[PDB]
C-alpha cells in the first residue's frame, strides 16, 4: 500500500539508520554514566529518564518495521528477531541493559556482515570444538583423580579441575603457579601437564584459525553474491576443481588441433 | 552370507552409531561422577555396575564387527584396531578408564575425519619438530653448564633445564620469575634467554601453523576423494603447475591460430 | 627550470637518501646518549648542539624539496606532509624528540612500503576493531556493576574496568591475579570472564590476521603496479572470478569445436 | 680420478650419512652426560675420550670431502663451510661444544631443507624487523626519560628499558608486575604501554607469519625445482599474473572464433 511504502522507504534510508545508531550510542553512554556510584539522586532519575526515552524510540522503530514489512516479512530475518527480543525483554518482569548496545552490530550493515560471517563459520569448526571438549573432559577427570586429594583448591572436584585446566591452557601461571607446586608432591606431573598444553594450544589455534579463515571467505563471497545477484562457488570448490578444469581444456585443445590437422 | 549381511548393515546404520555414541557418553558420565570423594559406598557399586554394563555393550559391538567384517577386514582399519585395544585393555590385569571416551573420536565420522587429517599432517612437520628438539637439547645442555651451580632448582640438571626452558618458551614468568633472578648473579643471561625465546616461539608457531594448514587441506581433499571416488591432486601440486599449465594452453592457442591463419 | 632540475635529481639520488638516513641515525643516537643522567654539563651542550646540527640539515633538505617539487607537488604526498610536521613541530613553542627517528620509515623506501601496506589495510578491518570496541564497552559496564563495590582497585569505575579487561584479554595474571580472587567473593565470576576471554582473543586474532594478510597482498600488488605501470586486480577479485572465467573458456571451446565439427 | 670417485660415491651414500649422523648423536649424548656434577673423575676422562673419538671422525669425514670435491668444490657450499668451522673451531685455543649438535641440521637433508627455507625467507622480512627495531628504540628512549628516575630497576637506562619493553611485548607480568606499579606514581602510563603492546604484538606476528609463509613456499618450490630440474615461478608471481593470463586466452579464443565465423 501507499502508507506501507513511504514508511518502508524511510526505514531503509541511511538517515534513519544513522538516527537509530545515535540513539543506541546515547543509550550505552547513559548506561555507562549510570555506573557512577557517586552520582546525585536527581542525576540517576535524569539518566534513567533518557534510558526510557531511548527504549521507547526503539519500540516505535520496531513497530514501524512490523507495519512496513509484515509479521512474516519482519520475523523472516534472524537479525530482526534478535532486535525484537532485545527490546521486548526490557518490558518483561536486570544488570543486562548494556547488552542493548549489541544492536550496533545489527543496525550497522558492515558490522552485521562481519558477525554474520563468523556465525556461518561456526558449524564448520564443530568437530574441532567437540575434539577440544573431549580432551578437556578426559583431562579434568584424570586431574581430579590424580591431584584432587593433595591439591583440593585446584583439582578438588571436576569443576575446579576444568577451571584450572582452562587456566593452564591459556598458559597463565601454569608452571610457577600450578605445575611446580604440584611437582613437589607428584614428581612426574609434567608428563600430564606438558602434553596437555601441547595438545590443547594446538587445537585451540586450529579452532581459531579455522573460524577466522572461513569467516574471511564467507564474507568475501557473500559480498560478491550481493554484487552479482547469483550463487558464488566457494573458493575451496574452485581450488579442488582447478586441476580438473585446466586439463579438460587441454584435452579439448588437443582434439581441436586434431580437427585442424586434417585441413 | 545372509547373517554376515544383516549384522553388517546394522553396524553401518546411523541408529547403531547413535546407540554406541550414547553408551560412550554414559560411560564417561559415570566415570565423571566416580571422581566424587563424598559418594556413598552403595553409589560407587551402582556406578561401577553401569561401567561394566557399558564395557560389555562394547564387547558385543566389537564382536558384531569382527563377525560381520572378518579378522582381516576388521583389523585392516587403524581406527578399528584402536577401538579393540581400548576395550581389550579393560580386561588386562588403572586410572586411565576415562581414555575410553576417546572412542567418541573413532565412532563419530566428522570427528574421526578431523583427527585423521591431523595425524596425516604430522609426517610433513617431522623436520620442524626435530629442529625444535635439537634447539631444546643444545639449549638445555648450555643452561645446565651455565646456571646449574647457582640456580639448581631450575637448571640443576638436564631434566630441570628442559622443564625450565619449556616454561620459558611458553613465556610463563620467564622474566620476573626466571631471567631477572638469574641476571642478579649472571648479568648477561639475557644474551642466552632472549635469542632462545625468539628462536623457539618462531619454530613452535611454524610447527603449529604447518599442522593446521596441512590438516585443513588433507581433510578437504579426502572429502573430495570420497565425493568423486578418485585421487585428488594436492592443492600445492596444482599451484606449482598452474603457470606451466596456463602457458602450455597459450602455446597451443598460438599454434591453433597459425593453422587458422592459412585458410 | 635548470636549477629546479639539478636539485630534484639530487633529492631522488641514493647518495642523498643515504646522507639523510645517516643524519636521522645520528639524531637518534645522540638523543639516546642524552638519556644518561650521569653525563657532564659540557657533554649535554655538545650533544644538544649535534641535535640542532641534525635538525638544521632536515630544514635545508625539506626546503630543497619544496623548491624542487613546488608547494602543491611536495604537499601532494602524505609522507612529505608527515616529514614536514616532524621538522616544523621542533620550531613550535617536549620529550617527543625521539619521534624524529620515525623519519627512517619515510626516507627508506622499503620501510615506507611496509608501513604503507599496513595503513591501507586498516580500513578493511574497521568493522572488526568496532566489534572488539563494542565487546569491551559492554563488558566494562557489566564488570563495573558486578564487581566494582567488592573489587574497587580493578573494577572500581569504567576506566579501571577497561584497563583490567585489557589485562585479562592479554591473559596476563588473569586467573591467579584477578579471577581466582574475584571468585572467593563471587563464585560464578568465571561465567563472565571465561566467555569474555574466548570472545576477545578470537576477535583480536581476527583483527591481527586480517591486517597482516591484507598488508601482505596490498604490498605485493603495489610492487607489481610499480613494475607494470598499470592497476593490479586484487587477488581476491581474481580468486572470486577464477571459476567464472574458467567455465567461460570451456563454453567457448565447446562452441569452437561445434564450428569445426561441420567441416 | 678413480680414487676421487670411489670416495665421493661413499660420501653421498645413505650409509655414510647414517654413520656420521650416529656419531653426531653420540657426541651430543656424551656432552649431555658431562653436565653431571656428581660424575667420577674416571667417568669424565672416559666421556671426554669419546668426545675426541667423535671429533677425530669428523676430521676424517671433512678431509674425505675436501679430497673428493676439491677446495673450490667443497667450500662452494655454505653448509660445508659451516661444517668446517664447527670442526676447525674445536682445534683453536669453551662451553659451546654442544653447538656441534647443530651439524644434525646440515647432515640430514630434510632438516637442511627446512632451515634453508627459513634462512632464504629472512631478507623478505628485513623491513619488518627494522620497523620493530625503530619502534623498540623510540619506545626505550621515551621509557627511560619518563620512568627512569622513579623506576630505575626497569627503566633506569636504555638497556634496562629495552629489556623491560621486550618483557612487556611478550606480555609477561606486564600489568601486575610492571604497569600497575608504574601507574601508582604515573597515572597515565597506560597511554604509553597499551599502544606499545598493540603495535609490537601486531608487528611481531607480521614478522613471524611472514617468515613462516615464505619459508613454506620457498621450500615447496625448491622441492619442485629439484624434481623438474628447472626454475619454479614463485606462487605470488603466478597469482599476480593469473588474471592477465586468463583474459589473454579469452581474447585469443574470441579472435579464434572470428576466423572460424568466416567459413
Ligand atoms: C567458502 C566457505 C567455506 C565453507 C562453507 C560452505 C558452505 C556453508 C558454510 C561454510 C566450508 C566450511 C567447512 C567445511 O568443511 C569442514 C572441514 N574442513 C576442514 C575440510 C567446508 C566448507 C570455506 C571457507 C574457507 C575455506 C574453505 C571453505
Ligand atoms: C595436500 C596435502 C599436503 C601434503 C601431503 C601430501 C601427501 C601426503 C600427506 C601430506 C604435504 C605435506 C608436506 C609436504 O612437504 C613438507 C615440506 N614443505 C614445507 C614443503 C608436502 C606435501 C599439503 C598440505 C597443505 C599444503 C601443501 C601440501
Ligand atoms: C588486495 C587488497 C585487499 C583489499 C583492498 C582493496 C582495495 C583497497 C584496499 C584494500 C580488501 C580489504 C578488505 C575487504 O573487505 C573487507 C571484508 N572482508 C572480510 C571480505 C576487501 C578487499 C585484500 C587483501 C587481502 C585479501 C583480499 C583483499
Ligand atoms: C616464493 C618465494 C617468495 C619470495 C622470494 C622470492 C625470491 C627470493 C626469495 C624469496 C618473496 C619474499 C618477499 C617478497 O617481498 C617482500 C614484501 N612483500 C610483503 C610483498 C617477495 C617475494 C614468496 C614467498 C611467499 C609468498 C610470496 C613470495
Ligand atoms: C572449556 C573450559 C570450561 C571451564 C568450566 C569452568 C567451570 C567452573 C566451575 C567452578 O569451578 N565453580 C563454579 C561453581 O560454583 C566454582 C568456583 O567458584 C571456584 O572456586 C573454582 O572454579 C576454583 O576453586 C577451581 O580452581
Ligand atoms: C619439549 C620439552 C620437554 C621437557 C621435558 C621435561 C622433563 C622433566 C623431568 C623432570 O624435571 N623431572 C622428572 C623426573 O623425576 C623432575 C621434576 O619432578 C621437577 O622437580 C623438575 O622438573 C624441576 O625441579 C625443574 O625446574
Ligand atoms: C582497548 C582497551 C582500552 C583500555 C583503556 C584504559 C583506560 C585506563 C584509564 C585509567 O584507568 N586511568 C587513567 C585515568 O587517570 C587510571 C589509572 O591510573 C589506574 O589507576 C587504573 O587504570 C587502575 O586502577 C585500573 O585497574
Ligand atoms: C629486541 C629487544 C632487545 C633487548 C636488549 C636487551 C639488552 C639488555 C642489557 C641489560 O639490561 N643488561 C646487560 C648489560 O650488562 C643488564 C642486565 O644485567 C639487567 O640487570 C637489566 O637488563 C635489568 O636491570 C633491566 O630491567
Ligand atoms: Na601469554
Ligand atoms: Na604471570
Ligand atoms: Na602469559
Amino acid at each position: 500500500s501507499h502508507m506501507s511504502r513511504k514508511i518502508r522507504d524511510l526505514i531503509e534510508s541511511k538517515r534513519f539508520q544513522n538516527v537509530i545508531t545515535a540513539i543506541i550510542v546515547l543509550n550505552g553512554a547513559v548506561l555507562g554514566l549510570l555506573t557512577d556510584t557517586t552520582l546525585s539522586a536527581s542525576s540517576q532519575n535524569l539518566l534513567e529518564r533518557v534510558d526510557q526515552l531511548c527504549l521507547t524510540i526503539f519500540i516505535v522503530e520496531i513497530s514501524l518495521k512490523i507495519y512496513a514489512y509484515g509479521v512474516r516479512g519482519f520475523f523472516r530475518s534472524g537479525w530482526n528477531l534478535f532486535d525484537f527480543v532485545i527490546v521486548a525483554i526490557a518490558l518483561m518482569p536486570r544488570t543486562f541493559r548494556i547488552f542493548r548496545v549489541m544492536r550496533l552490530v545489527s543496525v550497522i550493515p558492515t558490522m552485521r556482515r562481519v558477525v554474520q560471517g563468523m556465525l556461518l563459520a561456526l558449524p564448520g569448526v564443530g568437530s574441532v570444538a567437540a575434539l577440544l571438549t573431549v580432551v578437556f573432559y578426559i583431562a579434568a577427570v584424570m586431574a581430579t583423580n590424580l591431584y584432587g586429594a593433595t591439591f583440593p583448591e585446584w583439582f578438588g572436584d571436576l569443576s575446579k579441575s576444568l577451571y584450572t585446566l582452562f587456566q593452564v591452557m591459556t598458559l597463565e601461571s601454569w608452571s610457577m603457579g600450578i605445575v611446580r607446586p604440584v611437582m613437589n608432591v607428584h614428581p612426574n606431573a609434567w608428563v600430564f601437564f606438558i602434553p596437555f598444553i601441547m595438545l590443547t594450544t594446538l587445537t585451540v589455534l586450529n579452532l581459531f584459525i579455522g573460524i577466522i579463515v572461513d569467516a574471511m571467505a564467507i564474507t568475501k563471497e557473500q559480498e560478491e553474491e550481493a554484487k552479482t545477484g547469483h550463487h558464488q562457488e566457494p573458493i575451496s570448490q574452485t581450488l579442488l576443481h582447478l586441476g580438473d578444469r585446466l586439463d579438460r581444456i587441454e584435452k579439448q585443445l588437443a582434439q581441436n588441433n586434431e580437427l585442424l590437422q586434417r585441413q
Side-chain angles (χ1 to χ4, degrees), chain A residues 137-201:
Chain A
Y137 184 75
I138 297 172
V141 172
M142 279 173 65
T144 312
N145 293 343
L146 294 166
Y147 315 119
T150 46
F151 295 87
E153 297 286 67
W154 305 326
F155 309 102
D157 54 47
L158 221 63
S159 306
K160 291 184 187 167
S161 286
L162 280 166
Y163 178 85
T164 301
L165 288 179
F166 177 84
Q167 175 193 322
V168 160
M169 182 196 66
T170 72
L171 308 170
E172 198 282 294
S173 294
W174 79 266
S175 181
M176 302 299 259
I178 309 300
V179 179
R180 282 189 202 272
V182 174
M183 285 194 301
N184 309 311
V185 178
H186 311 268
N188 291 130
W190 61 272
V191 176
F192 169 78
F193 283 112
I194 295 173
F196 169 81
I197 292 173
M198 318 197 314
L199 180 62
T200 53
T201 62

Side-chain angles (χ1 to χ4, degrees), chain A residues 244-258:
Chain A
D244 301 79
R245 277 152 112 168
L246 286 180
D247 57 24
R248 247 146 61 200
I249 85 103
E250 293 169 32
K251 257 97 79 165
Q252 192 86 46
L253 282 178
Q255 136 208 356
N256 190 303
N257 282 65
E258 273 176 78

Side-chain angles (χ1 to χ4, degrees), chain A residues 27-153:
Chain A
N27 211 349
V30 300
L31 292 174
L33 303 152
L34 285 161
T35 71
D36 217 86
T37 46
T38 71
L39 276 178
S40 320
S42 63
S43 300
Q44 292 175 236
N45 307 355
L46 172 68
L47 285 177
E48 223 116 342
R49 170 178 294 269
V50 171
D51 169 53
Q52 297 177 37
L53 169 66
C54 291
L55 184 69
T56 69
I57 282 169
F58 302 143
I59 293 160
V60 181
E61 170 219 0
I62 288 285
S63 310
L64 243 45
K65 292 184 188 174
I66 300 175
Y67 181 90
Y69 299 96
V71 182
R72 288 199 296 275
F74 173 93
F75 288 110
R76 184 174 299 125
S77 188
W79 290 104
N80 276 334
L81 174 62
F82 164 64
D83 277 334
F84 183 86
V85 164
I86 290 298
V87 177
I89 264 168
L91 305 340
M92 200 120 288
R94 247 261 115 90
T95 171
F96 303 142
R97 307 200 281 179
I98 198 62
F99 277 111
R100 184 119 84 254
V101 181
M102 258 151 70
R103 289 208 62 214
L104 277 172
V105 156
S106 49
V107 166
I108 301 164
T110 56
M111 287 195 69
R112 191 168 63 230
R113 297 190 245 97
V114 160
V115 170
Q116 194 182 134
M118 298 196 211
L119 292 178
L120 302 170
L122 297 175
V125 294
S127 290
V128 179
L131 176 59
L132 184 72
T133 300
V134 164
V135 176
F136 254 82
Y137 184 75
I138 297 172
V141 172
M142 279 173 65
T144 312
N145 293 343
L146 294 166
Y147 315 119
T150 46
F151 295 87
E153 297 286 67

